[PDB]
Amino acid sequence: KKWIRGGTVVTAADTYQADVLIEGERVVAIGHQGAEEIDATGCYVIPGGIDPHTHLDMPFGGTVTADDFFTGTRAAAFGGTTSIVDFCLTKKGESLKSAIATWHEKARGKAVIDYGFHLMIAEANDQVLEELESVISSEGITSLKVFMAYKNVFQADDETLFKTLVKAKELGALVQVHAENGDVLDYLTKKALAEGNTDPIYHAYTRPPEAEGEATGRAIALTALAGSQLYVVHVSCASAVQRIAEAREKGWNVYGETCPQYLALDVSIMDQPDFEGAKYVWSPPLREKWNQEVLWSALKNGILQTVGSDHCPFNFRGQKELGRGDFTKIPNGGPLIEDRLTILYSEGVRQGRISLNQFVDISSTKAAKLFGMFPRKGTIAVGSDADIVIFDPHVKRTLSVETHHMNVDYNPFEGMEVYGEVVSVLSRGSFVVRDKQFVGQAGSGQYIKRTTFEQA
Amino acid sequence: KKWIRGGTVVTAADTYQADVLIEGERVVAIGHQLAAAGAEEIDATGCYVIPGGIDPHTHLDMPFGGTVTADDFFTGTRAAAFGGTTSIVDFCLTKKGESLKSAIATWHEKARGKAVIDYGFHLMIAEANDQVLEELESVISSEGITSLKVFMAYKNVFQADDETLFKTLVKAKELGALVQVHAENGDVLDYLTKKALAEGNTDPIYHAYTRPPEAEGEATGRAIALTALAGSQLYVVHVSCASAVQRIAEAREKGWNVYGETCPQYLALDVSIMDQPDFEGAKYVWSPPLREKWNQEVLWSALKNGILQTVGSDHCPFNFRGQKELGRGDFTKIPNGGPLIEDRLTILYSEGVRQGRISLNQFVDISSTKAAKLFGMFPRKGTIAVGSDADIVIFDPHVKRTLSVETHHMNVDYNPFEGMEVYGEVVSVLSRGSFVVRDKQFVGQAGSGQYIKRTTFEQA
Ligand SMILES: [Mn+2]
Ligand SMILES: [Mn+2]
Ligand SMILES: [Mn+2]
Ligand SMILES: [Mn+2]
């Protein structure tokens, strides 16, 4: 038994002042009038972040991502996030269970906060189409990623894409896509080398917005044809929001996600001199600052509805260095998991782009309702896991590597001045972070078995 | 020397009355009181005098199924002539691992000595590996070809992938070639196709529901996006539905060079006609399929406000008996295609001009001129001006006649517009100032057709 009193609680809908009362793992009562007191006067009390886009301990390049399931989830916790959903990678000619098996073992004993999996799909031949039944019922997985890019590495063709969509329809699974046209990026990529333009800046100009716009449109069209449901990850540009908007107007179930770096960084930052740009090499690439406004408008009027990190990080030394000679080899990815919550707060709420209620919905709730974790996760209500987060909106602080908790040598928002700080984080009503201290234990994270798809 | 007098001449722009004067192969002067010293008179009082149709979409003597198309280059071009058309542009098919010249070589020999009117080729592209990218240079300069078709459908038969599609676009940019695409998503059609069989829906009607509009919309959009990325230029052939015109409109608003084509059957037929008891629907099996009647209006609006700009036949015909019969058991095997080359011109006239959908000047532009300018045959073809080949067509707009197999000239056992009452009739057709058809009689000769070497792309 724990007792948060003095708090002003904020949810996707509500904003009020009241004591919440945790017992065991769950919120149990809320209101006025022997248990561990915890004072939250003047702080906001909010549901735990959920970050539906993670790659902890992933291979990409001949190397692996810096954070593991321990360092990763700690950093998430430190930065306000209580549940992640990571991407389990399948390998063509591929016992689907032996993949999942591997991703469980990647977490077991390391994770400190709760976590679920998405399942990647590489080919959709009969073998795989079969296993999918077992996994959705037995293995607690109900969302499926197909990459339309990374040619000859993760890329699916329209066939796989469609078959998966129709099966997803049949089973109750959310298909997710990385919507860039592999084929056109490859050419532009191999051409930019032909000409000897090998700086990291050309990672950005070798995958122009028109190519995200295109795959997004495409993946939407099949969804339409299939009668299934879509969730485009990491929408970075206007070309794509446009296509998403358009379909949602016709009433199809298409969904949208961004990350902070597309809300708060632009391409100019890549054009820097000493390989500094490689700090920004990730896919889709950063975009002209015009786009940030559109992405934000989308979040505000409910056109995009979730935000994730696509945390997938590599050290500037040794790892990002892997391709000084050429940007093909820079392992694509950023360290984004920790600051996500608070840049949403500071750049969005604090400067009048979204409401405080929307800030919760965008970072926590809506992701739960789309990924089948609701109401166990993503709200403060009676019954819900006590993934609470006490949050001080008044702090002014500067984001830096010197002070972040991710296991990486840099921070892409380095030097950015920001409001708001995470004071303490509960996970199922145990402290993971208290007064800004890691009091958690590795292995305390539980897998979350998610339910099948349902609307919002 | 020939002398058309009494005529009211109509072009893409002009409409006036005057005598034209042909000498040799070419128009030479126009007006009143010309110097027509002892030259063959030809009376055209009360008829319209117009440039020859150009039909930029033909497959004469093509293999599709294990069988070949009914018309050859002789029966075909004759029928074209009978129905107002003086120049075609046919699709030369390449075969993966494929001397590009040995394909072309074949398509020349398919025409030589058979063709009666002039003809050019498009070149199909199956893969765009380095070997092929190389040959393209030779062909555009030497072989007179400057337009390139990539099929986004017909999986495991003619289908290209986005790679081929893009590489070809960027090359086309570089060389000066118009890329053309058949914009349907092969992959989604295959699945729907193999599913419809799974369930035992094998009638020809399911040819139409196994390739819904959303799938044309999608490929059209896609093909446009690469064109954008490539800086190249596009020509979507046979737009059948609103989903695609929309995508074409959208891009032409942003100013890119994207172009559009329909055929008559999408302007004048709808899906209901497929749902018929016995194998009757197989008469309509072709791709893209017929569509809901709502779409006709949009296609027409597009032509009128300049959003689509050409019309072709996609004449590719097969006999109802024996040939279309090839798949009573299932529609996968119906060889896809219709007999559309002959009536094209006059349905454009009768359903469009005559009922107030387009202007008479537009009717020429839509059937003749604009196709010349996009395919690099202008001003040799597609207008009545001094210098231009004398591909004239005297045309009687007052006739009322019923279209039928009993009376058409294509070498096929049926007519898809069978029974349709129509205004306008072709009286006589000249090709480089020799009669091919006179007072509705075939006075032409096989072999008189000349290949047209076309120029590289340029706007409009
Ligand atoms: Mn991605
Ligand atoms: Mn990702
Ligand atoms: Mn076609
Ligand atoms: Mn065709």
Chain B: give the shortest CA distance to residue A264, in Å.
Answer: 26
Q: At what angle do helices B242-253 and B214-230 cross, to 10 degrees?
A: 20
Of the listed ligands, the closest to the CA of B237 is 3
CATH class of A48-375: alpha beta
Partners of B23 in the β-ladder: B26
DSSP state at residue A59: B
Q: Round to whole Å and give the CA distance between A151 and A145.
A: 15
Query: Does any CB of chain B come closer than 8 Å to the CB of residue A13?
Result: no
From the CB of residue B453, how many other CB atoms can be counted at a distance below 10 Å? 15
**Contact residues for B182 (Cβ-Cβ < 8 A; gap 6+):** B149, B150, B151, B152, B153, B154, B237, B238, B287
A353-375: burial string, b at 16+ Cβ within 10 Å, e else: bbebbbbbbbbbbbbbbbbbbbe
Judge contact between B258 and B252, C-beta under 8 A.
yes
Q: Please answer yes or no on whether B215 and A208 come within 8 Å at the CB atom.
A: no
Distance, CA of A184 to CA of B166 (rounded, Å): 7
AA identity, residue B215: A
Q: What topology does CATH give the domain B52-379? A: TIM Barrel (3.20.20)
This structure's resolution (Å) is 2.8
Q: A188 contacts in B (CB within 8 Å)?
A: 229
Residue B435 DSSP one-character state: E
- A157 lies within 8 A of chain B by CB: yes
- Which secondary structure element, helix H or strand E, spans residue B81, and what is its range? helix B73-82
How many whole angstroms separate alpha carbon A153 and alpha carbon A60?
9
CB A44 within 8 A of CB A322: no
Tell whether omega for the bond before B379 is within 30 degrees of 0, i.e. cis: yes
Residue A176: which of A226, A137, A223, A209 has the closest Cα? A223
Whether B218 and A213 lie within 8 Å, measured CB to CB: no
The verdict on whether omega for the bond into residue A412 sits within 30 degrees of 0, i.e. cis, is: no
DSSP letter for each residue of B355-372: TTSS-HHHHHIIIIIHHH
Q: Do B215 and A221 touch (CB under 8 A)?
A: yes
Task: Report residue A170 CA to chain centroid gap.
Answer: 26
Q: How many CB atoms lie within 10 A of CB A404?
A: 20
* Helix and strand counts by DSSP (H, E) for chain A: 13, 18
What are the C-alpha distances in Å from B108 to residues A188, A348, B112?
36, 66, 6
Q: Which residues precede gaps in chain A, with C-N > 2.5 A?
A: 33
Residue linked to tokens 């986004």: B152
Secondary structure element (H or E) that encloses residue B302, with its range: helix B294-304
Q: Read off the tokens for A217.
A: 């449109």
Q: Tokens representing A413?
A: 């928002």
- Tell me the domain boundaries of chain A: 1-47+376-456, 48-375
CA of B419 to the centre of ligand 1 (A): 57
**Helix %, strand %, coil % of chain A (to 5):** 35, 25, 45
- Is the Cβ of A158 closer than 8 Å to some Cβ of chain B? yes
- How many residues are there in chain A? 456
Output the six-digit token pair for B366: 């839509």
Task: Check CB contact under 8 Å for A159 and B221.
Answer: no
Task: Specify the residue for token string 């919760």.
Answer: A360
A146 CB-near residues (< 8 Å, 6+ apart) = A120, A121, A156, A160, A161, A164, A175, A176, A177, A178
Out of A159, A183, A221, closest to residue B163 by CB: A183
Inform me whether the C-beta atom of residue B187 falls under 8 Å from chain A C-beta atoms. yes
Pairing mode of beta strands A44-47, B147-151: unpaired
SS3 category, A132: helix
What is the bridge-based pairing of β-strands A388-398 and A44-47? antiparallel
Q: Token pair of A364, please?
A: 């926590």
Taking contacts as CB-CB distances below 8 angstroms, the residues of chain A near B163 are 183, 186-187
The three-class DSSP label of residue B347 is helix
> Alpha-carbon distance A271 to B120, whole Å?
50
Name the architecture of domain A1-47+376-456.
Answer: Roll (2.30)
Could you list the residues of A known to form a binding site for Mn(2+), using ranges.
Answer: 53, 55, 145, 178, 234, 310
Q: From the annotation, which residues of A make up the binding site? A: 53, 55, 145, 178, 234, 310
Distance CA(B49)–CA(B14), nearest Å, equals 12
Give residue for tokens 């559309």.
Answer: B340
3-state secondary structure A72-126: HHHHHHHCCEEEEEEEECCCCCCCHHHHHHHHHHCCCCCCCCEEEEEEECCCCCH
CA distance B162 to chain A (A): 6
Q: In the sheet where A430-433 sits, what is the strand order?
A: A15-17, A8-10, A44-47, A388-398, A417-427, A430-433
Residues in chain A with CB shorter than 8 Å from the CB of B167 are 187
| Residues on chain A touching B211 (C-beta within 8 angstroms) | none
Q: Which CA distances in Å does B214 have to A255, B161, B188, B218, B265?
A: 19, 19, 10, 6, 19
Torsion angle, CA of A390/A393/A396/A401, rounded to 10 degrees? 40
Chain breaks in chain B (C to N over 2.5 A) after: none
Say how far apart CA A259 and CA A283 lie, in whole Å: 12
Q: What is the DSSP string of B370-418?
A: HHHHHTT-TTTSSS-STTSB--EEEEEEEEEEE--TTT--SSSS--TTT
What residue of B is the nearest CA neighbor of A219? B218
Ligand 3 centroid vs B315 CA: distance in angstroms?
A: 10
Q: Which of A94-108 are b and which e, b meaning 16 or more Cβ less than 10 Å from the residue's Cβ?
A: bebeebbeebeebbe
Nearest to B225 among A158, A163, A214 (CB): A214
- Determine the distance from the C-alpha atom of residue A411 to the mean position of all C-alpha atoms in its chain, rounded to a whole number: 17
Residues 6+ apart with CB under 8 A from B102: none
Q: What fold characterizes domain B1-51+380-460?
A: Urease, subunit C; domain 1 (2.30.40)
Q: Is B294 on the interface with A (CB under 8 A)?
A: no
Spell out which residues of chain A touch residue B166, defining contact as CB-CB under 8 Å: 183-184, 187
| Token pair of A19 as six digits | 């004591």
Which chain A residue is nearest to residue B223, measuring alpha carbons? Answer: A214
Q: How far is A285 from chain B (nearest CA, A)?
A: 16
Distance of CA B403 to CAs A61, A66, B355, Å?
Answer: 66, 74, 18
Cβ contacts of A163 on chain B, cutoff 8 Å: 191
- Output the six-digit token pair for A150: 């990374």
C-beta separation of A443 from A111 below 8 A: yes
Q: Are B214 and A208 in contact (CB < 8 Å)?
A: no
Q: Which B residues in the span 228-287 are in contact with A, Cβ-Cβ below 8 Å?
A: 228-229
From edge to edge, which strands make up the β-sheet containing B15-17?
B15-17, B8-10, B48-51, B392-402, B421-431, B434-437
CB contact at 8 A, B285 and B204: yes
Largest CA distance in chain A: 73
Packing angle of the helix pair A126-138, A158-171 (nearest 10 deg): 40
Give residues with Cβ within 8 angstroms of A183, minimum separation 6: A151, B161, B162, B163, B165, B166
**Cα A218 to chain centroid, rounded:** 22
Neighbours of A35 (CB within 10 A): 10
CA dist., res. A122 & res. A154, Å (int):
7
Q: How far does the CA of residue B228 sit from the closest CA of chain A (Å)?
A: 8
**Contact residues for B355 (Cβ-Cβ < 8 A; gap 6+):** none
**Could you tell me if A213 lies within 8 Å of chain B, comparing CB atoms?**
yes
Residues of A in contact with B250 (CB under 8 A): none
Chain B residues whose CB is inside 8 A of the A211 CB are 225, 229
Q: How far is the centre of ligand 1, averaged over its atoms, from the C-alpha of A180 (Å)?
A: 9
Three-class secondary structure of residue A225 per DSSP:
helix
Does residue B191 belong to the interface with chain A, where contact is any CB pair within 8 Å? yes
Give the residue among B44, B43, B34, B60 at the shortest CA–CA distance from B9: B44
CB contact under 8 A, A158 and B188: yes
Residue A218 touches partner B, C-beta closer than 8 Å: yes
- The residue in chain B having the minimum alpha-carbon distance to the alpha carbon of residue A226 is B188
Residues B251 and B160: their CA atoms lie apart, in Å, by: 23
Name the structure determination technique: X-ray
Output the DSSP codes for A174-192.
EEEEE---HHHHHHHHHHH
Annotated binding site of B for Mn(2+): 57, 59, 149, 182, 238, 314
Tell me if B363 sits within 8 A of B54, measured CB to CB.
Answer: no
